[PDB]
Amino acid sequence: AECSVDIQGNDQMQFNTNAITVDKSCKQFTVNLSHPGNLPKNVMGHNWVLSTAADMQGVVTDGMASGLDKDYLKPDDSRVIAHTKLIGSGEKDSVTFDVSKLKEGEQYMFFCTFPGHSALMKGTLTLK
Amino acid sequence: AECSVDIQGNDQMQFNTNAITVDKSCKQFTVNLSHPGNLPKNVMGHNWVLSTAADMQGVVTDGMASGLDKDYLKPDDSRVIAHTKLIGSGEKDSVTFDVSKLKEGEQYMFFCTFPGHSALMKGTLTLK
Ligand SMILES: [Cu+2]
Ligand SMILES: [Cu+2]
């Protein structure tokens, strides 16, 4: 809360939120992802990946092609501002990034790169 | 085709049609399901299941619970009029069912029961 958010992705291929606001006073922001459910990583794993809206498509496509072994993310993709690893149910993960890598006036999107998920598992991240 | 239809479930969780009509003159009707794309069955499996519009959500909820190994369908689910196997990309499966199992003036829904897919993969079927 304020400089951290808890987000979850369930077995219904939905995130519990589709809008996160990062207050400009946070020096760093922390996302703690958990996966409520029963389905395993290779069938319904989720991750939380951040990029600009313009880069999202490319991240998702190259991510799909990197496979489960790469957590569906192209290794060292420079378009990815921050990301968790891919988790199956009952697993969790956390990521902290520098808010100074975000600029005011730019549209950012968070999403899951597990194949097909981004159509519903996505939302807005905004500096305010 | 006479007394048959071909439908494809792709890698974007989409069926290539949302309406099927069954000619009342057909004694039996066949659905031929294929899955274009490159994604494997555990990640993007699709089946085609038929029920009344009123039974679809109970079939989907109990199907998810039966899991992977049960092709995400409850064994001997009395509300399922007909269904294929769950198939991966490059696979094919047909189902033939008796048309006398369909009433005139009742609404039917076909859908995929792989978790999360019926939100997008579903359509109506009706006698004519
Ligand atoms: Cu996901
Ligand atoms: Cu499906």
UniProtKB/Swiss-Prot annotation, chains A, B:
<keyword id="KW-1015">Disulfide bond</keyword>
<dbReference type="InterPro" id="IPR028871">
    <property type="entry name" value="BlueCu_1_BS"/>
</dbReference>
<keyword id="KW-0479">Metal-binding</keyword>
<dbReference type="GO" id="GO:0005507">
    <property type="term" value="F:copper ion binding"/>
</dbReference>
<comment type="function">
    <text>Transfers electrons from cytochrome c551 to cytochrome oxidase.</text>
</comment>
<dbReference type="GO" id="GO:0042597">
    <property type="term" value="C:periplasmic space"/>
</dbReference>
<keyword id="KW-0813">Transport</keyword>
<feature type="binding site">
    <location>
        <position position="121"/>
    </location>
    <ligand>
        <name>Cu cation</name>
    </ligand>
</feature>
<dbReference type="GO" id="GO:0005886">
    <property type="term" value="C:plasma membrane"/>
</dbReference>
<feature type="disulfide bond">
    <location>
        <begin position="3"/>
        <end position="26"/>
    </location>
</feature>
<keyword id="KW-0574">Periplasm</keyword>
<keyword id="KW-0732">Signal</keyword>
<dbReference type="InterPro" id="IPR014068">
    <property type="entry name" value="Azurin"/>
</dbReference>
<dbReference type="GO" id="GO:0008270">
    <property type="term" value="F:zinc ion binding"/>
</dbReference>
<protein>
    <recommendedName>
        <fullName>Azurin</fullName>
    </recommendedName>
</protein>
<feature type="domain" description="Plastocyanin-like">
    <location>
        <begin position="1"/>
        <end position="128"/>
    </location>
</feature>
<dbReference type="InterPro" id="IPR050845">
    <property type="entry name" value="Cu-binding_ET"/>
</dbReference>
<feature type="binding site">
    <location>
        <position position="112"/>
    </location>
    <ligand>
        <name>Cu cation</name>
    </ligand>
</feature>
<dbReference type="GO" id="GO:0009055">
    <property type="term" value="F:electron transfer activity"/>
</dbReference>
<feature type="binding site">
    <location>
        <position position="46"/>
    </location>
    <ligand>
        <name>Cu cation</name>
    </ligand>
</feature>
<keyword id="KW-0186">Copper</keyword>
<dbReference type="GO" id="GO:0046914">
    <property type="term" value="F:transition metal ion binding"/>
</dbReference>
<dbReference type="GO" id="GO:0042802">
    <property type="term" value="F:identical protein binding"/>
</dbReference>
<dbReference type="InterPro" id="IPR000923">
    <property type="entry name" value="BlueCu_1"/>
</dbReference>
<dbReference type="Pfam" id="PF00127">
    <property type="entry name" value="Copper-bind"/>
</dbReference>
<dbReference type="InterPro" id="IPR008972">
    <property type="entry name" value="Cupredoxin"/>
</dbReference>
<feature type="binding site">
    <location>
        <position position="117"/>
    </location>
    <ligand>
        <name>Cu cation</name>
    </ligand>
</feature>
<keyword id="KW-0249">Electron transport</keyword>
